[PDB]
């Protein structure tokens, strides 16, 4: 912790202090969901973590829809960069 | 009454404090209640944790 977030921020920062950055939030949610699935592949019975992952995925989907409705160029760029297929 | 941790401004109990845990535990060994010890809820929870760890490390008895 405190390394993956900083790296993703430095990578997806459009401005010097751009931290809202729907793209940054999406990247953070993606990495968190991946880290969560890493341990869910073993502790299959942790349903509360599954609910948290569902919440994160809902946030991700809402952000993706907003970005697509706002700027399709940046939406496609984020797609090509992250591979969120 | 007056609490001890607030009066002393102390930090994490540092369960190693066998004398403090002793004087805060009943003579029989049972954990004294909050209404009698005068401590807050947080300090009482930390006290329970410390006394349990001590009892686990043979620093205080289970039965007397």
């Amino acid at each position: 912790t405190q390394e993956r977030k900083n790296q993703l921020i430095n990578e997806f920062k459009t401005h010097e202090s751009d931290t809202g950055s729907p793209e940054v939030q999406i990247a953070i949610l993606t990495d968190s969901i991946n880290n969560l699935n890493e341990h869910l592949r073993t502790h299959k019975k942790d349903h509360h973590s599954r609910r948290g992952l569902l919440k994160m995925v809902g946030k991700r989907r809402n952000l993706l829809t907003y970005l697509r409705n706002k700027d399709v160029t940046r939406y496609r760029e984020l797609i090509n960069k992250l591979g969120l297929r | 009454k007056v609490c001890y941790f607030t009066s002393n401004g102390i930090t994490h109990i540092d369960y190693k404090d066998v004398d403090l845990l002793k004087k805060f535990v009943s003579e029989r060994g049972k954990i004294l209640p909050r209404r009698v010890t005068g401590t807050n809820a947080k300090y009482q929870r930390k006290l329970t944790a410390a006394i349990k760890r001590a009892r686990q490390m043979a620093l205080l008895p289970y039965v007397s």
Partner: protein, 92 residues
Amino acid sequence: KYEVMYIIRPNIDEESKKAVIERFNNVLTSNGAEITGTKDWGKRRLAYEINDFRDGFYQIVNVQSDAAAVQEFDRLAKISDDIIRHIVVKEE
């Protein structure tokens, strides 16, 4: 940060106690766990009885590892008869 405290059986000579201490320290450093602090309370009377002794030697060690030498120390102490009790706690 992590903290480690364990109890050694009383019927052990000083040289054997030191040898066991160095053995467990080497075990901890098997991964590079720096020993940031050590303390030996010495001979203290146990509050309650254990396997065969009423007293023992208390040993404290401060460590900063990756939770692997911790498990090594645990499985070694649980097996070795020199140590009777031990617990590892986070200093956070």
